[PDB]
Amino acid sequence: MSAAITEYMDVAQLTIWAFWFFFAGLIIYLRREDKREGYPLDSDRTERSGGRVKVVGFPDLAEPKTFVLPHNAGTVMAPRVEAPTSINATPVAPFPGAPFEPNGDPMLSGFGPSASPDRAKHCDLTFEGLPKIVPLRVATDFSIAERDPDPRGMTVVGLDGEVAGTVSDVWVDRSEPQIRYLEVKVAAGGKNVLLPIGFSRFDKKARKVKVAAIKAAHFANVPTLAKPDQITLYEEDKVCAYYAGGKLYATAERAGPLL
Amino acid sequence: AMLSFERKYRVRGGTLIGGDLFDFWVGPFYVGFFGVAGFFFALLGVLLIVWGATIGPNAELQTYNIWQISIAPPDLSYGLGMAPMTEGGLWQIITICAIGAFVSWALREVEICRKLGIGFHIPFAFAFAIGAYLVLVVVRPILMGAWGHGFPYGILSHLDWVSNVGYQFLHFHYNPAHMLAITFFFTNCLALSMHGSLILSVTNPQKGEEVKTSEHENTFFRDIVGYSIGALAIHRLGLFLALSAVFWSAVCIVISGPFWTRGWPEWWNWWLELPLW
Amino acid sequence: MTGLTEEEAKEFHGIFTQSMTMFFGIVIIAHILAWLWRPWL
Amino acid sequence: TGLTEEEAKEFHGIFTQSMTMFFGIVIIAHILAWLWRPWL
Amino acid sequence: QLYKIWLAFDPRMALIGLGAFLFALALFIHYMLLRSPEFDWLLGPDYAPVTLSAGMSALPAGR
Amino acid sequence: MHKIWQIFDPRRTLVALFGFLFVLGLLIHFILLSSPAFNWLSG
Amino acid sequence: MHKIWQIFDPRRTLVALFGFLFVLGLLIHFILLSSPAFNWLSG
Amino acid sequence: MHKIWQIFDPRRTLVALFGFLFVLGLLIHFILLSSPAFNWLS
Amino acid sequence: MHKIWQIFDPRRTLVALFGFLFVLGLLIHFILLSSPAFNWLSG
Amino acid sequence: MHKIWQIFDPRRTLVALFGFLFVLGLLIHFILLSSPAFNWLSG
Amino acid sequence: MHKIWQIFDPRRTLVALFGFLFVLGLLIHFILLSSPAFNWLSGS
Amino acid sequence: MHKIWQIFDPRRTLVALFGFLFVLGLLIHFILLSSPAFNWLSG
Amino acid sequence: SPDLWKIWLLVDPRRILIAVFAFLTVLGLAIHMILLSTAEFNWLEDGVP
Amino acid sequence: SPDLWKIWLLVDPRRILIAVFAFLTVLGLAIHMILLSTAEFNWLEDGVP
Amino acid sequence: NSSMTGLTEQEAQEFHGIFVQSMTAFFGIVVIAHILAWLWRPWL
Amino acid sequence: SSMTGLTEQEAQEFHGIFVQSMTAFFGIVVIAHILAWLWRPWL
Amino acid sequence: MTGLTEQEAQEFHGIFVQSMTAFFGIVVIAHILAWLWRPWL
Amino acid sequence: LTEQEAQEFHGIFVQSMTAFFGIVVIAHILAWLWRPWL
Amino acid sequence: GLTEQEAQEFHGIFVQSMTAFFGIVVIAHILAWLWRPWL
Amino acid sequence: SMTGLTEQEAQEFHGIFVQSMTAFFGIVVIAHILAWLWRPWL
Ligand code: BCL
Ligand code: BCL
Ligand code: BCL
Ligand code: BCL
Ligand code: BCL
Ligand code: BCL
Ligand SMILES: CC[C@H]1c2cc3[nH]c4c(c3C)C(=O)[C@H](C(=O)OC)c4c3nc(cc4[nH]c(cc(n2)[C@@H]1C)c(C(C)=O)c4C)[C@@H](C)[C@@H]3CCC(=O)OC/C=C(\C)CCC[C@H](C)CCC[C@H](C)CCCC(C)C
Ligand SMILES: CCCCCCCCCCCCO[C@@H]1O[C@H](CO)[C@@H](O[C@H]2O[C@H](CO)[C@@H](O)[C@H](O)[C@H]2O)[C@H](O)[C@H]1O
Ligand SMILES: CCCCCCCCCCCCO[C@@H]1O[C@H](CO)[C@@H](O[C@H]2O[C@H](CO)[C@@H](O)[C@H](O)[C@H]2O)[C@H](O)[C@H]1O
Ligand SMILES: [Ca+2]
Ligand SMILES: [Ca+2]
């Protein structure tokens, strides 16, 4: 054997071409894996064709893979058929690609940044089968680190600076110990609502929790929990999505543009 | 066409500039003001590169070979002024278009982030890559005093630029910021393989097993290296490693020539000449 | 199944062949012209 | 699994004949290539 | 009645913003003078460039 | 052949066709300019 | 031709057309500026 | 042509037009500066 | 022109205005410094 | 031996085996081409 | 000895074995092709 | 002008001002040492 | 085969036509580019006429 | 073999049709590339005729 | 049932007629350009 | 409806203004090319 | 429709052409002075 | 922003624009005396 | 997941295909040996 | 009022702002006067 395959072809040239064929197959494989969610696409192409043309692009979809959930929570198929969901919005113009304007109060529309899918109405579970996100009042073995302030008792302040409530309890993740939610006693109504840690900016000196997402008045409409001591995956999405809607809807100037 | 869950997210507003003028989608892409600006910045820059390839360095050497196409910066004698189009001026125009396209891409990402109500980590992270490019073609050439210090626009020709810039300091491996940046690049790749492996091995376990848990994830690397950073923190670490690699790479090149002209191994003479030894 | 009726398959196949041979005929003429211009064998 | 038995037989009929047509054209091309420039 | 800037910009951000900008601008201009050999005061008041004789050249031939 | 528009969406076809033709026109002009035998701006 | 605006929406189409025309206009000027025989700024 | 403002919003168009005009003016000045016969700072 | 301040926010417009003027002022100073015939920091 | 297919899937074995044989055939052909004593594409 | 495959899965053990045997066979063939004394494709 | 301490924290600004001056004093000394016209440790 | 029409019950004609048109266009571009890349068949640089 | 037709009971015939056509196109392209790379069988740069 | 594009029979015929008329005009201009190009500089 | 949300009347009305704007643009272009040809013929 | 009710658009258009023609006149003066400085054709 | 705050801002904004413009013109006059460019 | 009866049929065809594939291979190696022996 | 400030502190903040401005610009003026005498740049 030798390095020269022909007068021009050599082993290194063959090796690099061999990689291109493998890499092409790898990209096709990866794109097919990418398409296990959200495909076939929601398209006008399908709509005018009466559903006779499924928009998948290239490569086409893969055969459904099986996710067996722990604790007999069920089995999900990664490529799955999903029922169409109506949107609480209307197009701002009739051309394709035009955005939609939410209907009613945008913070309550469940559209745009306030939209969320309906997840399972079951709590995420620890390896031992207990609910994962729970208040500190039921996860008695958990505690706040000594060097960090206790969130409980802190004043919750909305985006406008007005006081929204106080922190009654802290919800922790029992698998990876960390704060995920802050239970707020709303100043107006008194009904407890959850506040995700991702929307909470701590002011350690002032003992204040600043929520730039929504105003103090918006806290009254935060989606509530069925059971007081646990939260389902469905409820988690509903709560987080509501605060996210405030990043665009809470104040009129947040819609933009800047100039 | 949108994803089957995407329609409920295609909301009006959230633009930085333009309001409703360009607030629409073209196929999957969001356009906005900076989609229009970015696209025609890129389109012009791409066409000028093709035009730069059409005339080549000269008519004899002109080539459409994708490896050999090269739009070169001006000669150093042009300083920080503008050069004639066929003598590096085209490179200067393409560089301006590239900056316009890259920044518009970042700003379009900001508008998308506002629409979706997510953190601005992605455009912030992309700014580091843009900053590295700006260091290479703007900050460093200005510090050196000539636009000709920028790298040529060519798939292989800019490797010759990297090679020769490195050998302008006789052994570029000894650049301390370069060593730090490579360490971050190598660690990031290791962390990425680890994170990709752990997620895949947990959600695609052995046959006959259910999907594993976050407890398995922490246990696995505790069992291997005695520590688990956590599901959230690995993404902090991956972002930190990638951004630190680019930051230190930008530092390493901007000190190579503007703030250090000697061979890089000689820089370590401060340590060798410590009076302790 | 591709969502097409069985009569559509007959009808598509006929038009597909007509367009294919028409394309092939132009190609064959092009190669005859190209061969007369500059033979390669 | 999917395709039944009768259409499996029928598919082979067009598959075998079309492949044979491709093979025959290949043989003709290789006969022409050997006359043009033999390699052995 | 020029207070209105303080009703639309926080005193604290502007004062820190002004200080950072002014310090950066002063550093920048000081560096630009050092960039120019005519205004490079770090060379000394009685700075004299080395005299070149007998066909000396400070730099090698260029292009 | 008017039935091609019952299988192919005319809007997407026209977008693809107009885009390909514009790129093709640029490509052919660029090729000619790259050949000194056909660069019409050389004098 | 006026049905085309029932196929291509004026708002998105006009934005694409004007930018493509402007970029095309810029490219041709740049091509001429790069051609010594037609560089009107050569003096 | 007054109807173009029923397609494109005027207050948004003015900002886009200002940027386009400024960016075009910048480019032309730079192209002139790249030409020695028309570089006015030589 | 006077009620433009209801269309355009005076706080954000000024911030954009001064930023534009600063960048434009920096660019022209940079262009003059780059020009050897107008560099006032040389001899 | 006929009872092998209880564990090994007939379908995935064929594609795996055909793919293996194909790249094996390429490798052997390419090794011979790299050998001047067995390259059939030279003079 | 008849008590070997009650623990090792027939499918897994053959898959691991077949891959290993091919690699060993490939390696040995390549070593011999690399040794001028046993290269059978060199011409002599 | 005593009201500047109602705006800025006396503790943080004193650490910052002591930190900033110390670094400024370091760099100027190092710059002078690096300047032959002002290095005082050479003879 | 007189039953070759049955291919359009198995393969999607819309996707097949897109694939063949894309393949043919790329192949036509590739052959032209290869021909222009040779001294012998570059009809623009051959100097004829 | 009187039962070769049973290959189409286990694997989808549509996938084979595209896979065989894609594989043959690649194989045909590769062999042409190999021959062009040879001085002996390059029909574009041999001077014949 | 709607076709694969939603266009009716008359719509497809209506689009096809304008498409071929636009195609014919484009190709006719192309032919004129190539004739002028051939007179300017024959390439074959 | 239509692919763009434009009726027969609205599309025809847009097309009219589009065509006159297109014609005026083409007219200036034609004069520009006539002047350019007089300045420096290229063919 | 952007909400401009064919009279606001007409009213804005009048100011738009007026400012545009003022800008174009200023541009025309500059190009005349530029031509008097250094003709380019 | 009410129309009363628009009257106040416009007067100050125009006054500041005119002052900046006048200082700019003075600078360009001095620069022309220092080094004419046309 | 494949029963015994369809296993009996598969092995027969697979052996026939392997024997058919082997036979072509043997002829090619014979022809190659005549063309240029390697051992 | 968006800064959480009243009509009193803004008035006195401005007066100190210009008072610091005037001194800082006065030092700048003297610095440039001395620099021009030492080495004029024009
Ligand atoms: C080239 C000729 C001369 C020379 C020519 C000039 C000229 C001309 C000038 C100076 C000026 C200065 N020169 Mg000098 N200068 C020279 C050499 C030197 C050397 C040296 C060792 O070589 C040094 C250390 C200096 C130092 C200085 C400074 C004292 C001064 C810059 C003020 C400033 O930065 O405010 C900016 C920084 C501030 C902090 C401003 C504070 C105001 C704000 C409102 C405070 C906000 C506080 C808030 C908390 C924000 C804090 C900052 C952030 C937290 C980051 N010069 C050479 C020798 N120099 C300038 C001057 O006199 O300014 C008064 C000036 O005009
Ligand atoms: C090197 C010496 C000769 C040469 C020697 C040979 C030899 C020997 C062979 C070829 C073959 C081919 N050559 Mg040659 N060939 C040369 C130069 C060229 C040039 C060129 C521009 O220089 C081109 C474009 C080609 C192109 C071709 C293809 C037509 C064909 C392989 C296509 C394929 O992979 O089918 C695979 C892909 C498919 C989709 C096949 C489909 C099979 C169907 C079912 C059968 C009927 C076809 C049906 C109508 C579908 C149309 C597809 C057609 C193949 C177009 N040759 C030089 C001049 N060439 C091969 C051939 O004849 O194959 C037909 C072949 O054996
Ligand atoms: C030796 C070099 C020769 C040359 C020799 C050849 C030879 C030989 C051939 C060509 C072919 C082509 N040449 Mg040539 N050609 C030369 C120089 C050129 C130059 C140039 C600037 O110099 C250009 C632009 C071209 C361009 C072309 C294309 C028109 C064509 C390839 C089309 C294609 O890939 O379709 C592929 C993509 C599609 C078909 C998708 C389009 C779908 C269409 C719309 C289907 C419509 C259906 C319709 C009713 C029926 C089919 C009819 C046909 C499509 C017309 N040639 C030089 C002078 N050329 C080929 C050809 O004639 O093909 C027709 C061909 O065989
Ligand atoms: C080298 C010799 C000649 C030359 C030889 C040729 C030859 C030969 C041809 C051209 C053609 C063209 N030349 Mg020329 N050309 C030369 C120099 C130039 C220069 C220059 C600055 O030097 C320019 C700008 C051009 C520009 C052009 C274009 C107008 C045209 C390609 C259009 C296209 O690709 O559409 C494709 C893009 C699209 C279709 C997208 C547009 C989408 C729009 C919205 C829809 C339009 C479709 C419409 C309904 C129907 C189209 C036809 C209509 C009746 C107008 N040429 C040199 C001097 N040129 C071609 C032509 O005439 O085409 C008509 C052509 O065949
Ligand atoms: C080449 C000949 C001359 C020269 C020729 C000219 C000419 C001609 C001009 C100048 C002008 C200027 N020159 Mg000069 N100039 C020279 C050398 C210098 C040197 C130097 C050290 O060499 C310096 C520092 C300067 C500096 C200056 C500036 C004072 C001035 C530009 C101001 C500006 O752009 O504002 C723009 C920036 C702002 C208005 C705002 C800045 C604030 C920050 C940066 C913006 C952030 C946004 C902010 C937060 C907004 C908040 C809202 C408000 C609070 C309401 N020149 C040489 C020597 N120079 C111009 C002038 O006179 O303008 C007054 C001018 O026309
Ligand atoms: C070096 C000297 C000779 C040469 C010496 C040899 C020798 C020795 C051999 C080959 C073999 C092959 N050669 Mg050779 N060969 C040469 C040059 C070439 C050139 C070239 C362009 O130069 C090409 C394209 C080939 C091509 C080929 C292939 C046809 C074949 C390898 C196929 C394979 O890898 O199977 C891998 C892929 C598969 C196995 C997929 C399965 C495909 C088949 C159709 C399976 C069907 C099963 C059965 C038949 C079904 C029907 C049963 C009945 C219905 C009952 N040779 C030179 C000129 N060649 C080998 C061979 O003959 O194999 C057939 C072989 O042993
Ligand atoms: C900072 C950490 C790393 C990083 C991060 C990062 N990159 C990013 C992002 C982030 C967070 C994005 O959000 C953004 C994105 O959307 O990615 C999909 C992006 C992106 N990073 C990209 C590329 C990229 N990133 C690189 C590096 C990195 N990106 C870092 C290692 C590199 C390297 C190392 O070479 C490349 C090539 C793009 C895929 C995308 C930004 C796309 C974009 O800006 O689109 C607009 C522009 C065009 C479509 C074309 C513009 C063409 C020009 C007008 C002309 C050409 C100019 C150019 C200088 C030519 C040079 C060519 C030669 C060098 C060969
Ligand atoms: C997927 C990609 C597949 C690519 C093909 C893989 C098979 C090819 C394997 C090539 C292995 C190269 O192995 C080695 O090559 C070198 C370089 O020619 C040979 O080197 C020999 O040939 C060269 C070239 O005539 C001469 O200088 C001299 O006779 C000797 O050095 C060695 O004798 C050989 O052992
Ligand atoms: C380039 C990336 C984006 C950055 C944007 C800024 C680009 C450059 C800014 C424009 C500055 C132009 O400044 C102008 O440059 C040219 C070219 O050097 C100078 O020209 C001067 O040097 C050049 C070469 O050094 C000589 O050929 C010429 O004789 C001399 O006059 C002009 O004296 C100057 O007026
Ligand atoms: Ca010719
Ligand atoms: Ca030949």
Within 6 Å (CB) of ligand 1, which residues are found? E 15-16, 18-20, 22-23, 26, 30, 33, 39, 41; L 28; T 24, 27-28, 31-32, 35
Strands B25-26 and A208-210: unpaired
Residue G43 DSSP code: -
Tell me how far apart the alpha carbons of residues F6 and C11 are, in angstroms, rounded to a whole number.
13
Q: How far is residue O3 CA from its own chain's centroid?
A: 24
Instruction: Tell me the best of K34, K41, K42 to mutate to test the pocket of ligand 8, counting ligand atoms within 8 Å of each CB and taking the most.
Output: K34
Q: Which helix (H) or strand (E) holds A26?
A: helix A11-34
User: In Å, how far is T15's CA from the nearest CA of chain L?
Assistant: 10
Q: How far is the CA of L23 from the centre of ligand 5 (A)?
A: 29
Q: Do C41 and N44 touch (CB under 8 A)?
A: no
The verdict on E23 touching T (C-beta cutoff 8 Å) is: no
Q: Which of B200, I11, D40, B93 is nearest to T1 (CA)?
A: I11
**Backbone angles phi and psi of H28, in degrees to 5:** -65, -45
Structure-token match 């003066």, residue found: Q29
Q: CA-CA distance, H27 to E50, in Å (whole number)?
A: 43
CA distances from C8 to A84, C12, F8, O6, O7 (A): 29, 6, 14, 16, 16
How many residues are listed for chain A in this entry? 259
Q: List, in sequence order, every residue forming a beta bridge with A202; answer none if it has no partner.
A: A209
Q: Resolution for this model in angstroms, one decimal place? A: 2.2
The neighbours of chain E, by the rule of 3 or more Cβ pairs under 8 Å, are I, L, T
Q: B114 and B14 in contact (C-beta within 8 Å)?
A: yes
* 3-state class percentages of chain S: helix first, strand second, coil last, to nearest 5: 80, 0, 20
CA distance L29 to L8: 30
Question: Is B124's C-beta closer than 6 angstroms to any atom of ligand 7?
Answer: no
Rounded Cα distance, Q10 and N31, in Å? 68
Q: Among residues R27, H33, E38, H28, which one has the least CA distance to residue I39? A: E38
- Residue E32, classed as helix, strand or coil, is helix
Contact list in G for residue Q41 (CB cut-off 8 A) is 40
- Shortest-distance atom of ligand 3 to CA M44: 22
Comparing CA positions, the residue from A254, B108, Q19, G27 lying closest to residue H18 is Q19
**CB neighbours of B262 closer than 8 A, spacing ≥ 6?**
B169
C-alpha–C-alpha distance, residues H22 and G42, integer Å: 25
Q: Phi, psi (5° rounding) for residue B69? A: -60, 130
Interface test mutation site (partner H, options I23, I29, I34, I35, max chain H beta carbons within 10 A): I35
Q: Is the peptide bond before A99 cis (omega within 30 degrees of 0)?
A: no
Report the relative pairing of strands A163-173 and A66-68 from DSSP bridges. Answer: unpaired
B105 φ, ψ (degrees, to nearest 5)? -60, -45
DSSP A163: E
Touching subunits for chain Q (3+ Cβ pairs under 8 A): G, H
Taking CA atoms, what residue in M is nearest to O41? M49
Neighbours of B50 (CB within 10 A): 17
Helix or strand (DSSP H, E) at A75: strand A75-77
**For residues A163, A169, A175 and A179, what is the CA-based torsion angle, rounded to 10 degrees?**
30
The β-bridge partners of B153 are B71
Single out the residue of E52, E31, E49 nearest to residue E40, CA to CA: E31
CA angle B165, B169, B170 (to 5 degrees): 105
The Cβ of residue E62 has, within 10 Å, a number of other Cβ atoms equal to 6
Helix (H, G, I), strand (E, B) or coil at A195: strand
State which of A2, A6, A10 you would mutate to test the pocket of ligand 8, scoring each by most atoms of that ligand within 8 A of its C-beta. Answer: A2
Segment (H or E) for A179:
strand A179-186
Compute φ and ψ for B26, nearest 5 degrees: -120, 110
* First-last CA distance in chain J: 48
Nearest CA to A173 among A149, A148, A192, A198? A198
Measure the N-to-C terminal CA separation of chain L; round to a whole number of Å: 48
Residue I8 region by backbone torsions, left for phi larger than 0, else alpha for psi between -120 and 50, else beta: beta
Is I35 an 8 Å CB contact of chain B?
yes
Give the closest residue (by CA) to ligand 7 atom 53: B98
Chains R and S touch each other (3 or more Cβ pairs < 8 A): no
Distance of alpha carbon A132 from alpha carbon G40, whole angstroms: 74
C13 is in an annotated binding site: yes
What is the Cα–Cα distance from C39 to C33, expressed in whole angstroms? 10
CB of B48 within 6 A of ligand 7: the answer is no
Contact present, A194 and A156 (Cβ < 8 Å): no
Atom of ligand 7 nearest to the CA of B125: 11
Is the distance from CB of S10 to CB of S18 less than 8 angstroms? Answer: no
The span from the CA of L25 to the CA of O15, in Å, is 79
**Chain D residue numbers touching N13 (CB-CB < 8 A):** 3, 11, 15
The answer to whether the beta carbons of residues B205 and B265 sit under 8 Å apart is no
Question: Given the structure tokens 């009685």, which residue do they identify?
Answer: E46
Instruction: For residue N34, list chain J residues with Cβ-Cβ distance below 8 A.
Output: 41
Among residues G41, G38, H23, I36, the alpha carbon closest in space to that of B84 is found at: G41
Residues 6+ apart with CB under 8 A from B123: B106, B107, B109, B110, B113
A172 vs A132: CA distance, rounded Å = 8
Which uninterrupted H or E stretch holds E60? Answer: none
Beta-carbon contacts of O43 under 8 Å, excluding residues fewer than 6 positions away, are F38, M43, M44
Q: Is R24 exposed, middle or buried (0-12, 13-18, 19+ CB in 10 A)?
A: exposed
Residue B53 CB neighbour total at 10 angstroms: 21
Considering every ligand atom shown, identify the ligand nearest to the alpha carbon of residue E40 and give its number: 1
Strands in chain B per DSSP E: 25-26, 29-30
Q: What does the longest C-alpha to C-alpha distance in chain L come to? A: 51
Whole-number Å distance, alpha carbon N28 to ligand 2 midpoint, is 7
How far apart are the two ends of chain F, measured CA to CA in Å? 47
E1, E4, E5, E7, best to mutate vs chain T, most T CBs in 10 Å: E7
CA-CA-CA-CA torsion for A3, A4, A5, A10, nearest 10 degrees?
70
User: Relative to the CA of J23, which ligand 8 atom is closest?
Assistant: 1
B171: left (phi over 0), alpha (psi -120 to 50) or beta: beta
Query: Distance between CA A92 and CA A103 in Å, rounded?
Result: 11
Closest CA to B246 of B83, B134, B114: B134
Measured between alpha carbons, how far is H8 from Q2 in angstroms, rounded to an integer?
7
Rounded CA separation R30/L32 (Å): 37
**B235 contacts B117 by C-beta, under 8 angstroms:** no
